[PDB]
Amino acid sequence: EVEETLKRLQSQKGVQGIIVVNTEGIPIKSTMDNPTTTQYASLMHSFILKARSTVRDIDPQNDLTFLRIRSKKNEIMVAPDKDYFLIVIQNPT
């Protein structure tokens, strides 16, 4: 399913916007607007690729399956396993 997934991923906290990304960056889906979603998600894709390299440095067998950054104004989510790259825009609290 698609719509139910995004609905449950959004209303679980009243998230500002989430789109499903099953490809390596450059997603064409939008939740508020095309630019702030697509370019930011591609940027996230590049940095999670570099994070995968970073975690493979200590041991190549390790992989990153969970990534969150909770800062003063933003909380950003991504849970990559092979091509599923999450995005969550949310308040810090």
Next chain:
Amino acid sequence: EVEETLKRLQSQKGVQGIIVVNTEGIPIKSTMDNPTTTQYASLMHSFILKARSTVRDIDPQNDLTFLRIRSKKNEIMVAPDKDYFLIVIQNPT
């Protein structure tokens, strides 16, 4: 108190005291094997600076203190204040 902080940090699961990483990539505190921790902290610093650029691309007023790099073996907690970067190895359990 530095020793109080060390005792508080070593109380956490899978944590050996407190290790603090400078802006140079050299840990100011020594708790684990020196070469591995130095290279790992250097890559950590590279990634955290490039993630700082990441966030200031769209959030030029935010500061970073939280990031969850967890694998199926161990989690590393990275936290910069302005110059001291705390790295803590903690079991996912």
Next chain:
Amino acid sequence: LTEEEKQQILHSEEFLSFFDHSTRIVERALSEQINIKLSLNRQFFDERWSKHRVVSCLDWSSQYPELLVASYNNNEDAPHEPDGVALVWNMKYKKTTPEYVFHCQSAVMSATFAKFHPNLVVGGTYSGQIVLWDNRSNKRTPVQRTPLSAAAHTHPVYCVNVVGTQNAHNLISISTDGKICSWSLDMLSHPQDSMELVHKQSKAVAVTSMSFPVGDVNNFVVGSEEGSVYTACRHGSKAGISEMFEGHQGPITGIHCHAAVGAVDFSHLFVTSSFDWTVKLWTTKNNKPLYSFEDNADYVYDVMWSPTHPALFACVDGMGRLDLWNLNNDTEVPTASISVEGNPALNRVRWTHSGREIAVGDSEGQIVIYDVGEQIAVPRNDEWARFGRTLAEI
């Protein structure tokens, strides 16, 4: 830059912000959640080095709890084949060949790991020389060998053990003649100390086993071939045998002190395995055998206290039956008892330093690594009090 300005910058008093940051991140990261019987355990039987050549001694490495030293003594099949052979067996991975093999010109009769050197094997032989095996070296030949002089042993050495702390070691060895000798682990060209175990004036001791109590290095217990256990003081004005025991009418074939700690002391307790199937739960301070477990027609060969259970101890049989005795559970029937196939006269039992896994020797060379039930292996907090009460029973 270098590691001197970091100290001063730590001593600087701008660390209030860093301390608050650390406190906040730790207190926010405190919460943690999740994301989503007796059995034949293993075997060991060489064929090139284990054709007949019964097992003679067993041990585990304290530093490397996955490592076991064997000692195959008898050479009668082929005079040209190696006389003494010591095989080491690893636990981490299953193989059909021993990890490392060691050959000695005489027949190896006892062996053990080295505490100071975790990469070194020391064993006693039939001639009476203490034999080293530098595992770093690629040669099967012994690296360092003790002289067969009057200063050192000249009789079949059957008990060797290194004791002390990492910064103060002594390799104790006792031979059948009774001459105890401490060497330094690094230098064995000369006996750094030694003296001949003698009872009441002009009475030598036919030593055939020993055990040091946990912790103590100054006094220990010895089991003699003449069936009378003694206690000796290694260093002191009264160095030598200090106790006469009635013991049993048969040769002592094994001995071991208590091997547990954590609750009320039991280091005074130890077990001797005699030559008439009579193991003796029994203490140093008393002189009369506390209890005299007896059964069977054949007789025991070794008995080992459990490294973790303050009551359990194993028991060899020459009928191939290995039985574990849990005193707190019962005092008359073996708590566990199973017989290995082919009914061969087993010769040794050694417990893993974990206490969770047991080993047994064999009369044909096939060391069998047995596993024990979880309930029968690990004791409880009440187990020590129950053991105290059972001892207080009589």
Next chain:
Amino acid sequence: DGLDVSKEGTEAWEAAMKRYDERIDRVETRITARLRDQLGTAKNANEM
């Protein structure tokens, strides 16, 4: 049966033991039954 001074106390004591030992002989029958049904194995320790 208590501090009864008369020998009738001893007689009631005898009655008390004969019923007591009726129970006791029942216990003996039980223990001998468990004995014999647990025997037949061998001589050593728990067997005999």
